[PDB]
């Protein structure tokens, strides 16, 4: 059960220290061959190697970033730590963690979403799509938050096929998407339908029920 | 540093059809150990990459047979033998022999499948919308291919482009399709205003525009 997962921020002003953690399970740190790596992706563009620690505390950084670059490991606790030293609007990207046993990255975190911006955070509306108020289609729409990520969920995840969730669209400062499940008619509205929106920098999580009218 | 290149920089192929994706390296990949550290990944759709090849040719645990690595010092080759609907998404070849560790630019791998007209829904703006003083008219174009496809909205016959946004869903894992949404969004008073609010979609499968309609 190898497992990674990154926690940060989700926003930060310019010119401030980014922290990000690396929590893991599955594998030990100061077990030897082990190593825990920082890659990041602008969105849309390419990834970018940042840094790692072995088992044995040698760190690797990548040379256009490296004196801004701090890597750490706690073994004990089995965390590695990134800090970032004063950020710029070009460190807005998605960052991961990733186990190196050899050779490689082979897991591969969640990744955490970082934006650097100077605005405040603030958490989206959701509106039903009902229509309208053999198979049906509904959803939930998402407007007016910042910044990314949303996380949109149908039933606490219990129902996952049939839904399309399409790609966020900036306007005016502020991001919105649309998601939408085609469940059968017998379906709904005769059993409950859920959308679960989260947006963990504002610390938000709302629902929605699809009604009928 | 080592500039990985790699080649086409998106490719689309029918389902069970064969795939190859080239990386080539500035530099050699073959370090002192005398291996070469050239890994493969996969990275789909809202998700983190997943390693698939490494060291040029070794398969990682849980990964299909379909896929396969070979090449040698510079040169490395990433296969798709049969092209499943699951294997959508973004492939990117890693050297770790040299020190930065550098990542080719990514190869977007699209399937090509048997067209496919969309479906259409309008969904009027919500109540609880209207109560804060806008009004979103979405509508809502589902499993087309291909991805390309015309959106026009008409507000009581008459055609309206301000405030319009438009929104594509990333090809779909299982049938290959494309989702989108157009959404007209208004003030309450101004939605008050009219009756009569029409999208309609032109894509390639049909010359005739599928409209969808409410009056209010």
């Known amino acids: 059960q190898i497992t990674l997962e990154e926690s940060g921020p989700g926003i930060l002003q310019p010119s401030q220290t980014l922290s990000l953690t690396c929590s893991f399970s599955?594998?030990?740190?100061?077990?030897?061959?082990?190593?825990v790596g920082w890659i990041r992706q602008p969105s849309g563009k390419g990834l970018e190697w940042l840094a790692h620690?072995?088992?044995?505390?040698?760190?690797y950084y990548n040379p256009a970033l490296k004196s801004r670059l701090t890597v750490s490991k706690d073994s004990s606790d089995n965390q590695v730590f990134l800090k970032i030293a004063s950020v710029v609007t070009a460190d807005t990207a998605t960052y991961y963690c990733?186990?190196?046993?050899?050779?490689?990255?082979?897991?591969w975190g969640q990744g955490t979403t970082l934006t650097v911006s100077s605005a405040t955070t603030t958490a989206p509306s959701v509106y039903p799509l009902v229509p309208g108020c053999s198979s049906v289609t509904l959803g939930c729409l998402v407007k007016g938050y910042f910044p990314e990520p949303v996380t949109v969920k149908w039933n606490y995840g219990a129902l996952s096929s049939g839904v399309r969730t399409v790609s966020s669209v900036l306007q005016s400062g502020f991001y919105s998407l649309s998601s939408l499940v085609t469940v059968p008619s017998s379906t709904w509205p005769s059993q409950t339908v859920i959308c679960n929106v989260a947006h963990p920098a504002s610390k938000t999580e709302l629902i929605k029920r699809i009604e009928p009218r | 540093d080592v500039v990985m290149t790699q080649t086409p920089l998106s490719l689309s192929v029918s389902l069970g059809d064969q795939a190859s994706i080239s990386c080539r390296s500035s530099?050699?990949?073959?370090?002192?150990?005398?291996?070469?550290?050239l890994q493969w990944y996969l990275q789909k759709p809202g998700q983190s990459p997943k390693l698939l090849i490494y060291?040029?040719?070794n398969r990682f645990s849980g990964v299909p047979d379909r896929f396969s690595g070979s090449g040698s010092g510079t040169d490395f080759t990433l296969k798709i033998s049969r092209m499943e609907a699951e294997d959508l998404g973004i492939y990117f070849c890693?050297?770790?022999?040299?020190?930065?560790?550098?990542f080719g630019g990514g190869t977007k791998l699209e399937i090509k499948r048997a067209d496919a007209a969309p479906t259409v829904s309008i969904f009027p703006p919500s109540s609880e919308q209207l109560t804060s003083g806008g009004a979103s008219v979405v509508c809502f174009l589902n499993n087309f291919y291909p991805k390309d496809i015309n959106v026009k909205w008409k507000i009581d016959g008459s055609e309206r482009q301000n405030g319009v946004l438009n929104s594509w869903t990333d090809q779909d894992s299982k049938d290959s399709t494309y989702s989108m949404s157009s959404t007209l969004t208004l003030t309450k008073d101004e939605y008050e205003r009219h009756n009569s609010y029409t999208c309609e979609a032109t894509h390639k499968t049909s010359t005739s525009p599928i409209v969808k309609s409410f009056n209010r």
């Open positions: 530099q050699s990949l073959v370090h002192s150990n005398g291996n070469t550290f």
């Open positions: 620690i072995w088992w044995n505390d040698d760190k």
């Open positions: 060291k040029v040719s």
């Open positions: 599955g594998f030990s740190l100061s077990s030897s061959a082990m190593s």
């Open positions: 890693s050297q770790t022999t040299h020190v930065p560790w550098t």
């Open positions: 990733a186990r190196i046993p050899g050779f490689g990255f082979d897991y």
